């Protein structure tokens with residue numbers, strides 16, 4: 323998280339972490355939306371240009387961390403995936419439209435203080451809450467700055483980061499990027515005058531953008547950290563999958579069928 | 582998984598349930614009354 327501050331223990335208890343089986347790296351954030359399923363960005367799994375194609379037996383998942391680095395025995399749970407669900411209409415070879423995947427876990431997972439589901443948005447919560455200037459929250463463990471690499475980079479946190487970021491109107495999103503923006507995407511971030519900065523960045527992809535309703539005091543996931551041209555570049559905005567615009571698909575796979 | 586809410590969902594144990602706001606939560610609640 324560019325311009326992150328350390329998280330309070332317990333702040334994103336739905337935050338899952340994606341990990342390569344061997345050798346051991348963090349690949350993306352993700353969120354626990356049931357005891358059974360993890361939501362994440364499709365690009366965490368299939369991005370062809372970059373040899374990303376991850377088989378179910380190549381990833382395991384981590385729920386309930388705080389440290390990026392050290393296995394917190396007391397609190398943390400490690401599940402392997404039973405199955406993966408990338409969308410059939412995920413358009414990688416153009417603009418990553420519908421960059422959304424799902425992950426079914428082989429165990430059901432056991433909620434703690436520290437392990438707990440976020441709410442999926444309904445109609446009244448999207449319509450009310452998704453407007454320009456309402457800020458929502460981004461978490462994860464990836465870079466605090468843009469990097470190439472050497473033997474590694476330098477810019478990886480100790481602790482889960484937070485930043486809170488305004489949602490950006492569509493004209494100013496469209497206009498920030500050379501790239502074809504769909505009604506399935508939105509952008510967040512501070513406009514150029516606006517004093518504060520902050521962004522997701524490599525490592526934060528897959529993670530949740532959450533918004534808290536003043537109606538019932540709970541959290542809804544509205545975006546998934548999808549993409550950006552750099553990490554927090556002036557003039558450029560952070561791109562996010564409209565989870566709700568795709569609630570169609572999320573329940574397709576979870577109930578097997580049902581529209 | 583459901584839409585709308587699992588009854589338990591999105592209500593964090595250490596905060597929601599424990600009658601406690603976290604540190605950067607009023608930034609959001611502010612962004613709403615300054616919006617509409």
Ligand SMILES: Cc1ccc(S(=O)(=O)N[C@@H](Cc2ccc(C(=N)N)cc2)C(=O)N2CCCCC2)cc1
Nearest residue numbers: 365369522523524527547548549550551552560561
């Ligand atoms: C269409 C596109 C746009 C940007 C990039 S990137 O290399 O500049 N930036 C990276 C890393 C990244 C991820 C997320 C963010 C962000 N949400 N702020 C920023 C940067 C990216 O978007 N991804 C996700 C897709 C796989 C490549 C890695 C690549 C592809």
